[PDB]
Amino acid sequence: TSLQLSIVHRLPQNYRWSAGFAGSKVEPIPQNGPCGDNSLVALKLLSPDGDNAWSVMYKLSQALSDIEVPCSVLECEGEPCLFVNRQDEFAATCRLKNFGVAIAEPFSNYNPF
């Protein structure tokens, strides 16, 4: 049902927080060698959108962070875009799917979980 499910990704890259803001910062890894599996992954704009899906997505990133799962949510105009750790891609879309909103997240290599 519906016909307006416009999902976009490109590549996760390996990036981190710039030790200034946490919740409002992103920067890549210029050849710095993290512990490894502690890269971040990022999501582009999605659709469909509405105040439901916005409010719920945001209230859920907060809720997930309340447990063990720091997720990041920022808009620009009409482009809600998202940031998660690593395994938190599949995990997030899995729990979010139950909440009924839409999401744009992959589930890592061919769903490896």
Side-chain angles (χ1 to χ4, degrees):
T1 335
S2 309
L3 46 53
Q4 194 186 347
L5 204 116
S6 307
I7 308 309
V8 201
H9 186 63
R10 286 283 273 276
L11 206 285
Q13 263 92 54
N14 300 332
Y15 68 106
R16 65 168 288 163
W17 318 132
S18 217
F21 308 89
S24 65
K25 193 65 214 105
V26 291
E27 181 199 35
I29 293 166
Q31 196 196 54
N32 292 312
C35 290
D37 340 286
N38 203 53
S39 302
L40 295 177
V41 296
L43 279 316
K44 233 298 175 184
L45 73 90
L46 59 61
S47 90
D49 172 67
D51 183 68
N52 282 1
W54 174 221
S55 184
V56 182
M57 181 175 69
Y58 184 63
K59 289 170 64 70
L60 273 37
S61 45
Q62 296 281 258
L64 275 41
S65 194
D66 212 69
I67 314 303
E68 65 177 285
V69 187
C71 301
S72 263
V73 183
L74 293 175
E75 65 104 270
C76 289
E77 304 168 23
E79 281 83 86
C81 310
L82 247 59
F83 315 84
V84 264
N85 293 302
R86 199 85 182 96
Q87 32 284 332
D88 278 328
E89 66 184 294
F90 57 81
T93 174
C94 194
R95 44 180 121 77
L96 267 276
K97 252 112 174 39
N98 253 226
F99 258 117
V101 295
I103 53 276
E105 302 148 95
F107 304 77
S108 205
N109 291 290
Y110 44 73
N111 328 250
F113 66 121

